[PDB]
Amino acid sequence: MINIQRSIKLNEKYQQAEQYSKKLEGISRITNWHETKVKYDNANQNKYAR
Amino acid sequence: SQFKAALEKFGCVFDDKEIHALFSKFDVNRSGKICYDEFCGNFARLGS
Amino acid sequence: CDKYTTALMMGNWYEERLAPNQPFRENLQTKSVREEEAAISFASDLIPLSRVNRNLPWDTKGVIADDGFKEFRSVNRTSYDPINLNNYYNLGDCRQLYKHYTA
Amino acid sequence: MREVISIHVGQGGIQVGNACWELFCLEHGIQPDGQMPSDKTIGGGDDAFNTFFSETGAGKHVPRAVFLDLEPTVIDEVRTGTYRQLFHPEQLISGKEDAANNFARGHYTIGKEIVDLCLDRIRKLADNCTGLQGFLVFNSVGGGTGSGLGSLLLERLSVDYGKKSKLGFTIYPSPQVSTAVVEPYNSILSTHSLLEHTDVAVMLDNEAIYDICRRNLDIERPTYTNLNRLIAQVISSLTASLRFDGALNVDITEFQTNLVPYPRIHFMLSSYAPIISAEKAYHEQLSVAEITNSAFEPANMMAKCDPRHGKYMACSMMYRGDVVPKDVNASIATIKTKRTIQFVDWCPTGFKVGINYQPPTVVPGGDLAKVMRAVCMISNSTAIAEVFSRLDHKFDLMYAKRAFVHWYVGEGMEEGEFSEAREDLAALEKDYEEVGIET
Amino acid sequence: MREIVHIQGGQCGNQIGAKFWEVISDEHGIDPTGTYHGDSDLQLERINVYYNEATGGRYVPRAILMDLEPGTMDSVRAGPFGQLFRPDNFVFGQTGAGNNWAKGHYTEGAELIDSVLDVVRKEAEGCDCLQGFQITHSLGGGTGSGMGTLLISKVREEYPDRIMETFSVVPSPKVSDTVVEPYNATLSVHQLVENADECMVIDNEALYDICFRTLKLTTPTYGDLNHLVSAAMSGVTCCLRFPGQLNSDLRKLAVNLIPFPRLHFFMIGFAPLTSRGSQQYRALTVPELTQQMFDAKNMMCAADPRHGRYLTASALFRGRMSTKEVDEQMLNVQNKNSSYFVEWIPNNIKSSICDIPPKGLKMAVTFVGNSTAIQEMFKRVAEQFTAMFRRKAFLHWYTGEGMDEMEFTEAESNMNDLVSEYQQYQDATA
Amino acid sequence: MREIVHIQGGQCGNQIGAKFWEVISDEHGIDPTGTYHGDSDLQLERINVYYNEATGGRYVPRAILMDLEPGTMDSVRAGPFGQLFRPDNFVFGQTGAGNNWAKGHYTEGAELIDSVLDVVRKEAEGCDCLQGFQITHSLGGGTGSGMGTLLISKVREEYPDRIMETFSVVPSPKVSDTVVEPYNATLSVHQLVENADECMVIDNEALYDICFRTLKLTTPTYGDLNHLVSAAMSGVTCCLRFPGQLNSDLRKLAVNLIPFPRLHFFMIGFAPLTSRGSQQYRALTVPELTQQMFDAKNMMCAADPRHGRYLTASALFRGRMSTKEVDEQMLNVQNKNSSYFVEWIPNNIKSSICDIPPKGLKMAVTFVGNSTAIQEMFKRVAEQFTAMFRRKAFLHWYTGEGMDEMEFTEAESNMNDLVSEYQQYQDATA
Numbered sequence A: 001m002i003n004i005q006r007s008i009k010l011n012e013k014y015q016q017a018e019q020y021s022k023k024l025e026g027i028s029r030i031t032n033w034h035e036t037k038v039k040y041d042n043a044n045q046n047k048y049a050r
Numbered sequence B: 001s002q003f004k005a006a007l008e009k010f011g012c013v014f015d016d017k018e019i020h021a022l023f024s025k026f027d028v029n030r031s032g033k034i035c036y037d038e039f040c041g042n043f044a045r046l047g048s
Numbered sequence C: 001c002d003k004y005t006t007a008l009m010m011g012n013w014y015e016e017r018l019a020p021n022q023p024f025r026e027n028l029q030t031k032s033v034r035e036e037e038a039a040i041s042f043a044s045d046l047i048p049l050s051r052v053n054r055n056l057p058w059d060t061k062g063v064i065a066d067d068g069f070k071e072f073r074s075v076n077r078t079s080y081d082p083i084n085l086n087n088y089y090n091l092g093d094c095r096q097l098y099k100h101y102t103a
Numbered sequence D: 001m002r003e004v005i006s007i008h009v010g011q012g013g014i015q016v017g018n019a020c021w022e023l024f025c026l027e028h029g030i031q032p033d034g035q036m037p038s039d040k041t042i043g044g045g046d047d048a049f050n051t052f053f054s055e056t057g058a059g060k061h062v063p064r065a066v067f068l069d070l071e072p073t074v075i076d077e078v079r080t081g082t083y084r085q086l087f088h089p090e091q092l093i094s095g096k097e098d099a100a101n102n103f104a105r106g107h108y109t110i111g112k113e114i115v116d117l118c119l120d121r122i123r124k125l126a127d128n129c130t131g132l133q134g135f136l137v138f139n140s141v142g143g144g145t146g147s148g149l150g151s152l153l154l155e156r157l158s159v160d161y162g163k164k165s166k167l168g169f170t171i172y173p174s175p176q177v178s179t180a181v182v183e184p185y186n187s188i189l190s191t192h193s194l195l196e197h198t199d200v201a202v203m204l205d206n207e208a209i210y211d212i213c214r215r216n217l218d219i220e221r222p223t224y225t226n227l228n229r230l231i232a233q234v235i236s237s238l239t240a241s242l243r244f245d246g247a248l249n250v251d252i253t254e255f256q257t258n259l260v261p262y263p264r265i266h267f268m269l270s271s272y273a274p275i276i277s278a279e280k281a282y283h284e285q286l287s288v289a290e291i292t293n294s295a296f297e298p299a300n301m302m303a304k305c306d307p308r309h310g311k312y313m314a315c316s317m318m319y320r321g322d323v324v325p326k327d328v329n330a331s332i333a334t335i336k337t338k339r340t341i342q343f344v345d346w347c348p349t350g351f352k353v354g355i356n357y358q359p360p361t362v363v364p365g366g367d368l369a370k371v372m373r374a375v376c377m378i379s380n381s382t383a384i385a386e387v388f389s390r391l392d393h394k395f396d397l398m399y400a401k402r403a404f405v406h407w408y409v410g411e412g413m414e415e416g417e418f419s420e421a422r423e424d425l426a427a428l429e430k431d432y433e434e435v436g437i438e439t
Numbered sequence E, F: 001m002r003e004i005v006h007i008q009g010g011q012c013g014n015q016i017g018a019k020f021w022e023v024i025s026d027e028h029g030i031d032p033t034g035t036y037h038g039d040s041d042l043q044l045e046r047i048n049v050y051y052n053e054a055t056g057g058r059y060v061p062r063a064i065l066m067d068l069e070p071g072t073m074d075s076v077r078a079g080p081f082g083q084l085f086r087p088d089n090f091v092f093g094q095t096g097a098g099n100n101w102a103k104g105h106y107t108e109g110a111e112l113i114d115s116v117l118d119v120v121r122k123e124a125e126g127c128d129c130l131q132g133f134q135i136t137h138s139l140g141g142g143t144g145s146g147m148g149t150l151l152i153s154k155v156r157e158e159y160p161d162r163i164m165e166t167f168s169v170v171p172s173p174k175v176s177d178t179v180v181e182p183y184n185a186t187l188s189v190h191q192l193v194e195n196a197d198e199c200m201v202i203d204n205e206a207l208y209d210i211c212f213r214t215l216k217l218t219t220p221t222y223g224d225l226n227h228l229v230s231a232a233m234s235g236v237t238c239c240l241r242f243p244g245q246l247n248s249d250l251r252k253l254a255v256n257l258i259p260f261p262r263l264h265f266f267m268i269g270f271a272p273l274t275s276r277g278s279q280q281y282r283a284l285t286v287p288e289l290t291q292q293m294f295d296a297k298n299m300m301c302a303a304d305p306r307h308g309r310y311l312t313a314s315a316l317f318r319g320r321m322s323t324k325e326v327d328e329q330m331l332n333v334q335n336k337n338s339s340y341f342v343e344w345i346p347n348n349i350k351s352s353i354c355d356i357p358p359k360g361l362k363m364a365v366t367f368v369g370n371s372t373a374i375q376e377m378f379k380r381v382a383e384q385f386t387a388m389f390r391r392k393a394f395l396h397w398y399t400g401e402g403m404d405e406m407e408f409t410e411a412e413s414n415m416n417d418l419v420s421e422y423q424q425y426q427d428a429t430a
């Protein structure tokens, strides 16, 4: 009896903790693309003139 | 430089004065190119 | 040597003329090599193992002799090598328009 | 952002990974110690190396490759080779005893003491990876440790990761060109194990490439280095699109929906062109039409199989160089028109074409000449069942009287598991026979 | 690292071991004083396979030698390279065997075997990871054939999983030197079949024929035959000590060569062998190596390989060659001689490649074969045994040391069974 | 600083000490004239434990020489390093004990022991902080076994809390030279178990076996046995005199080796031992050292420890080395031979490390074990004693100085109870 509801509670807690990290990791990679973008903007005006 | 790197390999990260001391003691001819064959022979004999 | 003294052309007169030396056949009177000594190690029965002098080592080199080659290389070491990679770098486009010494 | 993980297991896998990573590190211009030679790079490739290399934060780069073997000879040979400062020292896993051409040794007795370590390394690699695209695995099937450890790793990964795509470049035994004597057992069990765990299978037999290099490079005494160089060339041509700009970029995920009609049928064979020496190249033409015609030449394929005995179901071809899409389309039309290559009725469209600007790179000390156009083709055909039928024939002839069975059974291997492999391969060959039946 | 220990017993075993150790010392560049003076670095990468290191930097072989009479040990110490062996591995009796199996296998062998078992145990446990054992001995003699095989059984009881190699100089009727040959030969072959993982038969008159015909010298001596056997034995395990393209260990050889647990008797050969007068006049090609290798006369056994069908063969090429030429030559020799290979096994010849050839040589081929031609040797041994046992000749010397004719009967029946279900596959067809 | 004085009696003890002091002086770099000529300050830092400070910067041993026959003193004075001993410490009787325990313990010993007791009291009071006492003698002789034991009794009465060690040489029935040994041996054992804190059994039979088999030198003398016992004697006390990873004193060894106060008999051994022609072929490493350390025939007692179960064991390592290798070798030898260790006291082995190796060696090991296999010595001694006693043979000599059969009976009963007690703690389980 009890161990059933215990399993549901643990699984629910862990899947919430999982989805939080999922979105948190998702945002960082778009931020990374944007930040490397300006850092690498130096080329392609130079390296294009040549 | 490679002697310093080799010592860093084993973890004996030392400073410049004693690295010159160690290098010069083995480099008897003072040319500046030590022979690690004689180096390893010396250390093997000491370890015997 | 066919019941003869190898200065004659009975069968196998030629390739055995190339014999190295093999001192044993003309020195089987020396015996000697009485050089094991009483080692007192290898062994004891306390008596050391009694030594009987042996004869000459009999030549050897039965396998085909070395054909003056050193060898001792690995196919993987030979195949890649640093030389090709260094050559295909910090070089090239050398046509000797003027004359200049190069390594 | 897109990375793949490369696995090299078995002695053949290691000796092909050597050439693969030689070509890779040369193509992006990386010194063997790993240090970027700077030399006014100003980010010339910019971000084109993260697919295969990861920056250490300051200077050198480390490849995303894992090397597995139980006999330390190849491993410490690599550690004393010329790429000694490149690889991660504890990422080159070396075992204790070789499996010694025994499948059960590497799958039930010795293999379990290394898979945990290998999974740990794969985990720490994937943790650093952020845009993982898939797994590319190399292994020999005619070997004990290769087949066994490959099967165990595929089993573990199929549940630890799941949906991530897996592409395996397997080297099945040649018809008569063969080294070992018990390899039909290892091959049959390994293909049984991988049939339902691997996603893409690529045939890479040996004697076919022997004939290729004999006919094109005119090399009468080729060695395994030429083999590995050709394989690495094929791999780089296949994987260029992920890291280089192109007109029609194709991802590795653009393979399951283009080459796999049914879940069971996922075995294909490759071809590459042009293959020419350095003397017989500079007065020739290397036209797109002639290279794509030579690609479909049956004698030019990488595997010993006659495509004229079977139908075609799918072909994916990658062009690299300055190719013209209109020329590619015209050549494709000519290929479709010419009758000998007959496509199956239910596949009115069968071609997946990719284009990349980057010309192929040549390695110093190599045999291939510097070429300005190339094409690599992967084909799924019903004729591949011939090699399976041949392997089944050999297996039946030697299992008729239970030869070599004791070596397996004494290692914990159960006697009956050979049977289920037999019925499974019978079902697979029957499926291949069925799919070619017209409606 | 996967090191193996050496054990030798009897006169022939001791002499073969001495010559083999001299050959290996020459190969690895270790001097008679035990100090290394080699040239290339590769000589040390697997030096631990055959030698242990001691304080002072000297390397000593891990070989244990054993006999019931001290004369052979006196000889081996006084001979060249006699200072390599540590004094602890010499074990001996004081009485000798006198070519009597019971003397060396029941009373004196049993009372002496404890010390040698202790020595082999400590030597095996000293090294890190075992790989197997190799033995060199004779079956026509007393102390070897009895006490060595007793040691074989004892060590097999204690190490069931390790691989076992025997190099048996099985005596032939043409070169006969003892009348009690059939008795001890039959008993030893009875005891060997259930314990030895691989057996390698060598024949004295076959070696004499090789020396007369190929090497072409009037007056050979046991030194030359020992040298040939040593070269073959060293070529067996080249891959374990040197890098190669297709490495193969002893377990790989056993798996590739053993169809059934009781079919483990092999016949070996070495190439190239040529006379000193024609040393410079021959090319160095894989076709020539294989042509010399597959020749029936080149083999080291009295059995004619062409009187039966090969079950399995293995070759260990050395040097830098091309797998293409190696394997195409293997294919060609398997196709033009389909009559001599049993049909129901495909590609019954295995190849291995090593990068380091013997010093001063480029391409060398060590060949090992499991075929049905070995039947004839056991058949002649059996006919001699029955013709000499039916009259109970020389029987009382055995029966007077706790030996009964029941074990002789069992041994002859077992050898006959080996002959029977060894030749069955010759006529068995798929 | 926790110094210890030396007491020795009998010609046996005198001979042992003559070479023990030579070995110690060599270790500490002391010339025969007593002037320091060492090389490292470690050799000089901890000299006060054994050598006092005499006039002129010289050092004299704090050893007492005591005996009833002065020819032994005359001989030991003229031996090597004989000038070290101060003339005061010599005490001697002019009659002799005559191999008679009664004469050496009641008439002459009682009359003479006052002077030696005064001398030892002076020497003990002179030291700043005394650590303990060590005696060396033989139980087969008269003067030692009587008067040294009486001195032990008085010393234990006078200094209660200090530690006592006794190097006891008991006669084995094989190498016997005296007919009245069982009587005085039993009497000495019964008196000595009353007061001794630690006992080290030493056997001439075992020493002869060691010299015959390990050192393999053809002509052993008493000097070689003295050398072995001197090395073992010095090994146990190394850590008190030199720095190391883990310090350990005699009291620590006693605590870790004494389960019960009546169980204070130990069996000791030293490693490594090799001949002269075998030093080149050995590698001095922890595996070999621990293999020789637990070896049965290595022991310096006739007792086979495989006949019983070890209660406690200790190991003292000399040299510079890593710790885990000692630890894991100990764990492996405990795990692999769990049947020879009693199971209700797990982890019954102690290890200690000192970084100063013996001169001429790089690694050394000293082993002290408390095991139940010692009981067979007392069993056979009691057998001989009762066989001689049922007929009252040689009894009038002992009855001639007031001793009675009550003492013999109670000593026999006391040692029989000790044997039964040792058996009891062996044949017990939780």
Ligand SMILES: Nc1nc2c(ncn2[C@@H]2O[C@H](COP(=O)(O)OP(=O)(O)OP(=O)(O)O)[C@@H](O)[C@H]2O)c(=O)[nH]1
Pocket (backbone or CB within 6 Å): D009, D010, D011, D012, D013, D015, D016, D071, D098, D099, D100, D101, D102, D140, D141, D142, D143, D144, D145, D146, D147, D171, D178, D179, D180, D205, D206, D224, D225, D227, D228, E245, E246, E247
């Ligand atoms: N084309 C090619 N094939 C190779 C190469 N190396 C090994 N192989 C194949 O590998 C097969 C035998 O297996 P191995 O690679 O020798 O060894 P393994 O697969 O690791 O298995 P074990 O022998 O137990 O170690 C041979 O039949 C070859 O076809 C290579 O460098 N090139």
Ligand SMILES: Nc1nc2c(ncn2[C@@H]2O[C@H](COP(=O)(O)OP(=O)(O)O)[C@@H](O)[C@H]2O)c(=O)[nH]1
Pocket (backbone or CB within 6 Å): E010, E011, E012, E015, E016, E097, E098, E099, E138, E140, E141, E142, E143, E144, E145, E146, E169, E171, E177, E204, E207, E222, E223, E225, E226
């Ligand atoms: N090829 C070769 N055979 C040998 C050599 N020494 C002895 N033999 C053979 O050993 C056989 C005699 O074996 P024996 O010494 O009596 O065996 P044991 O009684 O057990 O010691 C003879 O038939 C010889 O042919 C040798 O140096 N070379």
Ligand SMILES: Nc1nc2c(ncn2[C@@H]2O[C@H](COP(=O)(O)OP(=O)(O)O)[C@@H](O)[C@H]2O)c(=O)[nH]1
Pocket (backbone or CB within 6 Å): F009, F010, F011, F012, F015, F016, F099, F138, F140, F141, F142, F143, F144, F145, F169, F171, F175, F176, F177, F204, F222, F225, F226, F229
């Ligand atoms: N280890 C050793 N044992 C000795 C020495 N001298 C005598 N013994 C032994 O002592 C026993 C006799 O003891 P004994 O001399 O009567 O003792 P004491 O009467 O007290 O001097 C003999 O069995 C000898 O084996 C020696 O220098 N070293």
Ligand SMILES: [Mg+2]
Pocket (backbone or CB within 6 Å): D010, D011, D069, D070, D071, D098, D145
């Ligand atoms: Mg392998």
